[PDB]
RNA sequence: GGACGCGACCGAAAUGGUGAAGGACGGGUCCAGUGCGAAACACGCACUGUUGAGUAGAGUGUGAGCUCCGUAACUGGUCGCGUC
């Protein structure tokens, strides 16, 4: 049977200065096998903890590592800014090796509002036969938040994707846009277009439109 | 002075056959143990491979077995992945990493490559199409104003945007590419600014894509309405 | 009485053959675990384990001891005989 590292929480949000514990449970004993990694968002992995418990050359104190049977800790005692990344897992007490799915260890901030921005498709791109629709919602926290898009008023479903932004390195909020896809003859069929935004920091639902043709 | 830089990465179709390379150097492989490992795009990490020392034994992850062959040229400090009958799953980053001196550092993997990336796909590769995302004929929301440019329906990743060659940086948002049912990737960049100076300030997104010999400059400007 | 001499019997270091014993006679080897050699496996070293291992050996030891049948050094013992 493959050895299974089962890590939680699979997120996390902290402020700096906190203690945090992040878990990984192996399927079966792993003897002391395991590591623990540092990963930034475009970077390569870290390398923090070997051998369950062992800090590895370089890497700062506060970040220790222990073992309880099959159970495995990584503690970052005290937080620091540079502290917020993905931490994995793994065990390598035999072939395959295994990682755990890891933690995202984000960090806390005060409530934040979105701005929230629609963009019409552009005539240049009707010209090609497909209509995209963009909303934006900018440097909003927590990061949890809820998009719709309405045509004439209609729930749109299943013709739409969203993408967000890494926690900002500095004001630490999060944006968010959505695309709307639609055939150029859908598109000039309906008239107003919109998308409903609520947030927690929204007093109350927040609706951005235009209407197709004005402009 | 240690250092792994993989090599080889790029788009292939599906059961097509691709191999990277892993270039060592500040070190001698022939005195490790080297892993390969992947991460799907937002996904975690998955061990795929590895090569004993002294004995070239090699192991795989399940994902792979019968598909994949680690490997290693010492007269060239290099380690390869030879990878056949590719899948759209094996789509990823692939690492490769060294295994420490049990000494020092047990079996953690204290080196690391940058990554190269391995895209599996029956699309071709396409310039993306960058069309404006103009700022409303509106003023309010935030005290500023929004606009960007949406890179649409390029292959395969990645992109880079800048805004006016890099002078603005400030405000900026360049969103994570979204893969598209067609196939296709599409991102938008976007950027906040003083709705006081938009038919006065200059907005220029810079968009270049150079799997596709693809760079493009579009200026933003208030639509005529 | 005792000494010398011969013989027999017993004893006996040593030694050839023999057949039971497995870990409380051992060594070798293998196996498991742990640590070390730039070393997870394979290779080597060190440590640990026999409620890890055949007394058909699976040994370029079945080695020691023992069971049982012989040869036997001689410092021994006993008895008989010869002589002093
Ligand atoms: C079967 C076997 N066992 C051996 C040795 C041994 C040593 C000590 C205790 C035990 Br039980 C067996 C051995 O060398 N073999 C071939
Ligand atoms: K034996
Ligand atoms: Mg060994």
């Known amino acids: 049977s493959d050895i299974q590292m089962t890590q939680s929480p699979s997120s996390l949000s902290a402020s700096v200065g906190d203690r945090v514990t992040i878990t990984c449970r192996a399927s079966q004993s792993v003897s002391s096998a395991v590591a623990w990694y540092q990963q930034k968002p475009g970077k390569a992995p870290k390398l923090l903890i070997y051998?369950?418990?062992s800090l590895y050359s370089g890497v700062p104190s506060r970040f220790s590592g222990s073992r309880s049977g099959t159970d495995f800790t990584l503690t970052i005692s005290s937080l620091q800014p540079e502290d917020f990344a993905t931490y994995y897992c793994q065990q390598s007490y035999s072939f395959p090796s295994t990682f755990g799915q890891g933690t995202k260890v984000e960090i806390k901030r005060t409530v934040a509002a979105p701005s929230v921005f629609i963009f019409p498709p552009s005539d240049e791109q009707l010209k090609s036969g497909t209509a995209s629709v963009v909303c934006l919602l900018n440097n909003f926290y927590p990061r949890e938040a809820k998009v719709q898009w309405k045509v004439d008023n209609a729930l749109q479903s299943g013709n739409s994707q969203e993408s967000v932004t890494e926690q900002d390195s500095k004001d630490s909020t999060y944006s968010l846009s959505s695309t709307l896809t639609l055939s150029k003859a859908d598109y000039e069929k309906h008239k107003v277009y919109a998308c409903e935004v609520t947030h927690q920091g929204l007093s109350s639902p927040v609706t951005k439109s235009f209407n197709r043709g004005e402009c | 002075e240690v250092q792994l830089v993989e090599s080889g990465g790029g788009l292939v179709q599906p059961g097509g056959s691709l191999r990277l390379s892993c270039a060592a150097s500040?070190?001698?492989?022939?005195?490790?143990?080297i892993h390969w490992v992947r991460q799907a795009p937002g996904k975690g990490l998955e061990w795929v491979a590895s090569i004993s020392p002294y004995s070239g034994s090699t192991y795989y992850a399940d994902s792979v077995k019968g598909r994949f062959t680690i490997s290693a040229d010492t007269s060239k400090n290099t380690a390869y992945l030879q990878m056949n009958s590719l899948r759209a799953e094996d789509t990823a980053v692939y690492y490769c990493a060294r295994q420490g001196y049990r000494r020092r550092s047990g079996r953690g993997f204290d080196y690391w490559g940058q990554g190269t990336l391995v895209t599996v796909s029956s699309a071709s590769t396409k310039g993306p199409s960058v069309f404006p995302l103009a700022p409303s004929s509106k003023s309010t929301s935030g005290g500023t104003a929004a606009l960007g440019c949406l890179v649409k329906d390029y292959f395969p990743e990645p992109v880079t945007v800048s805004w006016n060659s890099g002078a603005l940086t400030s405000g900026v948002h360049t969103f994570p590419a979204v893969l598209q049912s067609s196939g296709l990737y599409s991102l938008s960049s976007v950027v906040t600014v003083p709705s006081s100076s938009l038919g006065t300030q200059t907005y220029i997104c810079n968009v270049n894509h150079k799997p596709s010999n693809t760079k493009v400059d579009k200026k933003v400007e208030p639509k005529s309405c």
């Open positions: 051998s369950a418990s």
């Open positions: 500040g070190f001698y492989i022939s005195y490790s143990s």
